[PDB]
Design an enzyme around this catalytic site. Structure first.
Site, PDB file in Angstrom:
ATOM      1  N   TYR A 142       1.825   0.270   7.722  1.00 40.06           N
ATOM      2  CA  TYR A 142       2.180   1.442   6.828  1.00 40.06           C
ATOM      3  C   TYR A 142       2.579   2.589   7.718  1.00 40.06           C
ATOM      4  O   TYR A 142       3.626   3.220   7.392  1.00 40.06           O
ATOM      5  CB  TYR A 142       1.057   1.826   5.991  1.00 40.06           C
ATOM      6  CG  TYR A 142       1.459   3.139   5.028  1.00 40.06           C
ATOM      7  CD1 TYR A 142       2.322   2.804   4.129  1.00 40.06           C
ATOM      8  CD2 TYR A 142       0.834   4.282   5.224  1.00 40.06           C
ATOM      9  CE1 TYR A 142       2.679   3.871   3.354  1.00 40.06           C
ATOM     10  CE2 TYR A 142       1.110   5.349   4.555  1.00 40.06           C
ATOM     11  CZ  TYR A 142       2.042   4.940   3.338  1.00 40.06           C
ATOM     12  OH  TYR A 142       2.231   6.241   2.718  1.00 40.06           O
ATOM     13  N   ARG A 149      10.905   5.538   7.574  1.00 44.00           N
ATOM     14  CA  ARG A 149      11.404   6.262   6.751  1.00 44.00           C
ATOM     15  C   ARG A 149      11.576   7.607   7.155  1.00 44.00           C
ATOM     16  O   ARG A 149      12.785   8.152   7.043  1.00 44.00           O
ATOM     17  CB  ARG A 149      10.459   6.145   5.463  1.00 44.00           C
ATOM     18  CG  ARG A 149      10.995   7.019   4.374  1.00 44.00           C
ATOM     19  CD  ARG A 149       9.848   6.746   3.133  1.00 44.00           C
ATOM     20  NE  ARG A 149       8.517   7.036   3.457  1.00 44.00           N
ATOM     21  CZ  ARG A 149       7.487   6.801   2.834  1.00 44.00           C
ATOM     22  NH1 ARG A 149       7.952   6.193   1.323  1.00 44.00           N
ATOM     23  NH2 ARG A 149       6.192   6.778   2.837  1.00 44.00           N
ATOM     24  N   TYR A 202       0.989  15.932   4.757  1.00 46.43           N
ATOM     25  CA  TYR A 202      -0.310  15.357   5.195  1.00 46.43           C
ATOM     26  C   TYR A 202      -0.660  15.582   6.582  1.00 46.43           C
ATOM     27  O   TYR A 202       0.261  15.770   7.358  1.00 46.43           O
ATOM     28  CB  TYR A 202      -0.410  13.731   4.913  1.00 46.43           C
ATOM     29  CG  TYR A 202      -0.520  13.270   3.561  1.00 46.43           C
ATOM     30  CD1 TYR A 202      -0.846  14.016   2.224  1.00 46.43           C
ATOM     31  CD2 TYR A 202      -0.477  11.766   3.343  1.00 46.43           C
ATOM     32  CE1 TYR A 202      -0.990  13.176   1.009  1.00 46.43           C
ATOM     33  CE2 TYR A 202      -0.986  11.375   2.129  1.00 46.43           C
ATOM     34  CZ  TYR A 202      -1.047  12.055   1.031  1.00 46.43           C
ATOM     35  OH  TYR A 202      -1.137  11.539  -0.507  1.00 46.43           O
ATOM     36  N   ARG A 215       5.426  13.309  -6.474  1.00 49.75           N
ATOM     37  CA  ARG A 215       4.323  12.789  -7.527  1.00 49.75           C
ATOM     38  C   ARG A 215       4.967  12.155  -8.863  1.00 49.75           C
ATOM     39  O   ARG A 215       4.353  11.060  -9.407  1.00 49.75           O
ATOM     40  CB  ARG A 215       3.160  13.560  -7.567  1.00 49.75           C
ATOM     41  CG  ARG A 215       2.502  13.983  -6.036  1.00 49.75           C
ATOM     42  CD  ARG A 215       2.030  12.956  -5.426  1.00 49.75           C
ATOM     43  NE  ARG A 215       1.686  13.327  -4.084  1.00 49.75           N
ATOM     44  CZ  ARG A 215       0.825  12.285  -3.385  1.00 49.75           C
ATOM     45  NH1 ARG A 215       0.368  11.257  -3.722  1.00 49.75           N
ATOM     46  NH2 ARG A 215       0.621  12.904  -2.122  1.00 49.75           N
ATOM     47  N   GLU A 325      -4.191   1.682  -7.575  1.00 50.21           N
ATOM     48  CA  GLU A 325      -3.330   2.404  -7.645  1.00 50.21           C
ATOM     49  C   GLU A 325      -2.476   2.117  -8.773  1.00 50.21           C
ATOM     50  O   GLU A 325      -2.461   0.775  -9.406  1.00 50.21           O
ATOM     51  CB  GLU A 325      -2.100   2.475  -6.619  1.00 50.21           C
ATOM     52  CG  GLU A 325      -2.784   3.299  -5.394  1.00 50.21           C
ATOM     53  CD  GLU A 325      -1.488   3.572  -4.497  1.00 50.21           C
ATOM     54  OE1 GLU A 325      -0.470   2.816  -4.599  1.00 50.21           O
ATOM     55  OE2 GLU A 325      -1.442   4.185  -3.693  1.00 50.21           O
TER      56      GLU A 325
END
Ligand code: 3EB
EC number: 3.3.2.13
Length: 331
Positions: A142, A149, A202, A215, A325
């Site tokens: 990840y 990205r 983050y 979000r 999720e």
């Protein structure tokens, strides 16, 4: 003046006949127990992702808008467009290393959206094989994906605040697959959650490069527009909550979804009408442990509408300690 329909979703049984001949199909993602290449099937981009472990959980996620006017393949991306919206799918193979390939894939996505004239990304999905495994370089997959990205945004001069709703979820094989929706222009409002830290803010615990995504995203005119909700986890601030407790994580995930789409949060982002969980449809619920799927199904069934299309998929989450999720949309 000109008739336009914003993108919307259907869940279909894989392998079932096209009984109605619906010209509005843009593209198709087959969730199941294996993967394929990306291709066009009569103008519709298609691929299969390995997002669950039982065939009886397989289904097809079908994106629609109106009759596509053109389709093609460029740089591995199969795409279909209407005059107002674009759907694309692209993947990179199973590998020991993903950052460079992910940066190239996202570069190609940003470049295609620019070249075709659909610069406003509306929704992205990333199906990441072995998301919690360690890559050949010694880094969690990840995190390797996030490096790539992030690098692509810099390569494209892309403002992180423009990245829309997203999913970053595991697959059981098949490298990394990216699906996206984009718009020619118009309204594309990225929405944050007031009790959840913005992803690209983050702290470096989650690094070396942070995730980036909104979000939720509102897309389209006030009447006719859509609210796409990101994959939503049991997090408060940036922190995983309810460690080891899938019920508690699922309740907080649903709470976070309700907060994002609520009247006052939407008002604060310039969106005029609010929603409740019963309004959400075409939900995918990702669950890490097989032994938790029924537990989660029951928690969700107590809060979601009985008429909502809901698909549970057995697959890993972006952090090892996240157990569940939920994503979905309001049409
Ligand atoms: O950070 C989180 O809130 C949970 C994980 C998550 C959710 C949605 C999208 C992504 C992504 O990397 O694209 C990751």
């Amino acid at each position: 003046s000109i008739s336009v329909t914003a993108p919307y979703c259907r869940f279909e049984k894989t392998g079932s006949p096209d009984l109605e001949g619906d010209e509005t199909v843009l593209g198709l993602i087959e969730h199941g127990t294996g993967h394929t290449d990306v291709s066009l099937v009569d103008g519709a981009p298609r691929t299969a992702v390995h997002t669950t472990t039982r065939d009886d959980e397989a289904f097809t996620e079908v994106w629609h808008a109106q009759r596509p006017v053109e389709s093609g393949m460029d740089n591995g991306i199969a795409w279909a467009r209407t005059d107002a919206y674009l759907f694309g799918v692209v993947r990179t193979g199973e590998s020991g290393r993903y950052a460079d390939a992910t940066a190239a894939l996202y570069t190609n996505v940003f470049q295609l959206t620019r070249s075709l004239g659909y610069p406003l990304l509306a929704r992205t999905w990333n199906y990441v094989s072995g998301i919690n495994t360690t890559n050949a370089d010694g880094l969690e997959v990840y995190r390797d994906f996030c490096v790539g990205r992030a690098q692509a945004l810099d390569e494209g001069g892309i403002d992180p605040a423009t990245m829309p709703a997203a999913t970053g979820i595991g697959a059981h094989g098949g490298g990394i697959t990216c699906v996206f929706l984009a718009a020619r222009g118009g309204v594309r409002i990225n929405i944050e959650n007031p009790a959840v830290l913005t992803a690209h803010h983050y702290p470096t615990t989650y690094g070396p490069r942070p995730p980036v995504f909104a979000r939720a995203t509102w897309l389209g005119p006030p009447e006719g527009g859509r609210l796409f909700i990101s994959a939503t986890a049991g997090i408060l601030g940036h922190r995983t909550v309810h460690h080891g407790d899938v019920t508690g994580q699922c309740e907080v995930a649903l709470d976070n979804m309700a907060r994002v789409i609520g009247a006052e949060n939407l008002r604060r982002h310039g969106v005029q009408r609010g929603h409740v969980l019963a309004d959400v449809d075409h939900l995918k619920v990702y669950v890490r442990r097989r032994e938790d799927l029924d537990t989660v199904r029951r928690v969700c069934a107590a809060r979601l509408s009985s008429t909502a299309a809901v698909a549970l998929l057995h697959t890993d989450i972006a952090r090892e300690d996240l157990l569940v999720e939920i994503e979905g949309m309001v049409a």
